Amino acid sequence: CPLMVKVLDAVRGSPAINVAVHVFRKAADDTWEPFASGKTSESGELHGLTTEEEFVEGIYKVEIDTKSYWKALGISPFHEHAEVVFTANDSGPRRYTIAALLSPYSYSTTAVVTN
Amino acid sequence: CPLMVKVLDAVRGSPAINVAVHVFRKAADDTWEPFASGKTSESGELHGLTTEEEFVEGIYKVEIDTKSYWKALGISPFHEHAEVVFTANDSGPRRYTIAALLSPYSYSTTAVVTNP
Amino acid sequence: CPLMVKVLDAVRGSPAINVAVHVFRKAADDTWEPFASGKTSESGELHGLTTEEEFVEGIYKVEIDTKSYWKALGISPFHEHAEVVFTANDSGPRRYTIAALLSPYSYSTTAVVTNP
Amino acid sequence: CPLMVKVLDAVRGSPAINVAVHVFRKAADDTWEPFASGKTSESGELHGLTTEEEFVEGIYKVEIDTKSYWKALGISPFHEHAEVVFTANDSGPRRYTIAALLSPYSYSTTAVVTN
Numbered sequence: 281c282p283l284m285v286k287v288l289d290a291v292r293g294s295p296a297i298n299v300a301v302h303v304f305r306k307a308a309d310d311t312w313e314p315f316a317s318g319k320t321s322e323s324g325e326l327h328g329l330t331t332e333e334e335f336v337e338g339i340y341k342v343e344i345d346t347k348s349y350w351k352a353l354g355i356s357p358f359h360e361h362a363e364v365v366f367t368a369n370d371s372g373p374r375r376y377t378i379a380a381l382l383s384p385y386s387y388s389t390t391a392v393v394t395n
Numbered sequence: 396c397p398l399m400v401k402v403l404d405a406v407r408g409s410p411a412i413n414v415a416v417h418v419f420r421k422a423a424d425d426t427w428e429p430f431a432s433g434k435t436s437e438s439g440e441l442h443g444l445t446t447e448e449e450f451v452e453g454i455y456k457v458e459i460d461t462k463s464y465w466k467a468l469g470i471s472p473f474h475e476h477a478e479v480v481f482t483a484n485d486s487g488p489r490r491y492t493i494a495a496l497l498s499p500y501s502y503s504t505t506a507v508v509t510n511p
Numbered sequence: 512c513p514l515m516v517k518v519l520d521a522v523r524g525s526p527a528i529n530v531a532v533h534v535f536r537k538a539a540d541d542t543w544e545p546f547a548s549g550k551t552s553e554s555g556e557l558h559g560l561t562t563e564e565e566f567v568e569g570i571y572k573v574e575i576d577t578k579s580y581w582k583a584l585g586i587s588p589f590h591e592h593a594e595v596v597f598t599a600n601d602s603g604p605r606r607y608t609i610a611a612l613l614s615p616y617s618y619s620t621t622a623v624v625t626n627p
Numbered sequence: 628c629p630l631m632v633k634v635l636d637a638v639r640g641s642p643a644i645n646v647a648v649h650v651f652r653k654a655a656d657d658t659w660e661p662f663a664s665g666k667t668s669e670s671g672e673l674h675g676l677t678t679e680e681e682f683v684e685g686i687y688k689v690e691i692d693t694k695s696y697w698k699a700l701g702i703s704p705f706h707e708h709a710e711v712v713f714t715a716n717d718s719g720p721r722r723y724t725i726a727a728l729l730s731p732y733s734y735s736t737t738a739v740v741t742n
């Protein structure tokens with residue numbers, strides 16, 4: 281699995297469950313084409329988005345539906361969503377984990393790239 | 396000043412200076428229209444982007460060009476840019492500070508919203 | 512002002528007001544001695560803790576009483592407090608801003624260090 | 628395993644490996660008594676610190692030796708260490724994960740409490 285997403289909730293100190301996640305790849309058209317999508321699991325994780333074959337070098341966007349998550353909790357959030365845009369590179373390590381820590385008025389994101 | 400951007404560098408412990416920022420507003424046809432742009436100062440701040448009259452309700456996107464920033468320091472970073480998307484002035488006018496704390500493989504963004 | 516503390520609330524998108532802050536300096540016997548203390552203002556800032564003369568080289572600890580803060584908002588948080596420990600003025604005097612961004616189960620702290 | 632620590636490096640986008648971690652429990656003496664310690668693994672994780680029997684309600688301090696980590700990388704860091712102080716509570720969920728994301732002049736920490 282070369283791309284995994286992990287979403288955490290900083291208010292409840294828990295994994296962010298059932299969060300919609302959409303992945304896009306930039307096309308020569310210069311527009312974002314849908315690539316993969318999922319809802320996070322009970323552990324806040326989303327796996328099996330793509331394969332090694334499919335995940336070629338390019339610019340990818342990971343879009344996390346944070347607003348719907350906070351709305352579900354009855355908490356008024358600042359952001360429409362959290363979007364992480366990055367370039368996938370062959371020179372780098374094989375596996376990418378995109379992590380997001382969510383708060384109603386803030387988020388943090390990090391990438392953990394490993395072999 | 397209803398919209399201010401502050402960018403900090405978590406590697407150097409400093410303001411992130413001369414960072415390009417672009418602000419977009421969602422149009423009637425759903426396209427992102429250019430709204431305002433600038434560079435952060437020596438204090439990592441960008442002020443004077445808009446006015447109270449111009450800054451109407453809407454969905455706005457603040458794009459911070461972090462990749463150029465890191466590249467000028469010799470660092471090849473993970474992210475193309477940091478993007479902050481939010482609905483503004485939904486419940487009347489407010490003043491917004493969008494802050495970003497940058498590292499090569501990570502970034503944090505928070506909003507401070509105050510009532511005029 | 513060589514040492515300033517800024518505290519923000521990531522739930523409300525606001526300054527974190529009236530937060531108690533205690534600053535300690537490591538003594539000759541390795542004990543933490545009280546150095547300065549105060550509460551954040553309506554802007555989430557605490558200034559006037561020390562002077563250039565008083566703020567000598569040393570290891571300092573900035574303790575932010577986040578648990579009292581959250582409890583007054585009805586929230587039972589994870590952390591007792593946020594503690595920031597650092598060596599200051601090691602290479603000559605500097606101005607330090609210690610910033611903390613608070614959530615009930617998480618906190619982020621960054622330093623902005625500038626040369627007088 | 629009721630207490631795990633996970634340490635990530637925001638500069639290299641990788642797990643923070645071989646980082647010293649010390650856990651303390653507050654004593655009636657009002658002083659920190661050593662409880663457990665370890666070095667993070669190649670995945671940035673430290674497990675098997677304690678048992679369910681041993682990990683009673685109380686105030687605990689997790690102290691991460693961030694300065695030595697950055698020194699090893701030749702990067703000048705701001706903090707002496709990262710310390711996370713919290714109260715363990717029976718009413719809450721059984722498992723605690725203390726995570727830290729490190730930068731030379733900043734860190735973030737979060738707790739993920741689950742059953």
Ligand SMILES: O=C(O)CO/N=C(/c1ccccc1)c1ccc(Cl)c(Cl)c1
Nearest residue numbers: 492494496503507610611612619620621
């Ligand atoms: O709205 C604001 O005031 C700007 O936000 N500022 C800061 C900050 C502020 C001053 C000094 C250092 C960081 C900030 C932002 C983000 C984070 Cl994650 C942290 Cl620990 C601090």
Ligand SMILES: O=C(O)CO/N=C(\c1ccccc1)c1ccc(Cl)c(Cl)c1
Nearest residue numbers: 377379381388392726727728735736737
């Ligand atoms: O595990 C991974 O590969 C990615 O995890 N990243 C985590 C994290 C990890 C475990 C538990 C809690 C947070 C994370 C992310 C962002 C932040 Cl700001 C923090 Cl303090 C932790």
